[PDB]
Structure 1
Amino acid sequence: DGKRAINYQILKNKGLTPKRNKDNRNSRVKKRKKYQKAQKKLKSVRA
């Protein structure tokens, strides 16, 4: 059809926001890998 449809850039309207990771959507996975790096550090220092 000849109807000029909307664009995703101009519909959701998130301009100049910094590009964040996939893991910033869910807090559970981010805290999972944060605790996992913490226990890796603890296992590295408690040898």
Structure 2
Amino acid sequence: GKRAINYQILKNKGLTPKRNKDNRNSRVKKRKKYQKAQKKLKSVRAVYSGGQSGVYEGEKTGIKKGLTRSVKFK
């Protein structure tokens, strides 16, 4: 029959936004920012990803005729 104090009165926090388990450990947030930005620049360049892994199944995602991604000399 002896009282106690609960968690929020012991910690004395409250009325904060919902923060992030990714935001807790800085090594993790500087990992889940990189491997997103690692997968981001599969959309501005076309980076090397090992090469011909299986047998050559074709280029598998579309080749278009009227497009030249070659920087030209003015």
TM-score, L = length of structure 1: 0.82
How many pairs were matched up? Answer: 46
Q: Which residue of 2 aligns with 1:27?
A: 26
Partners of 2:40 and 2:22 in 1: CA distance: 21
Higher-Rg member (1/2): 2
Stretches of structure 1 lacking an aligned partner (at least 5 in a row): none
Shift of 1:39: 1.0
Shift of 1:45: 2.4
Residues 1-47 of structure 1 deviation map (CA, whole Å, 9 limit, x = unaligned): x1111110111011101110111110111110101111101123222
CA RMSD of aligned residues (A): 1.0
TM-score, L = length of structure 2: 0.56
Q: Which residue of 1 aligns with 2:15?
A: 16
Q: Whose helix proportion is higher, 1 or 2?
A: 1
Identity of aligned residues (%): 100
Q: Which stretches of structure 1, 4 residues or longer, exceed 2 Å deviation after superposition?
A: none
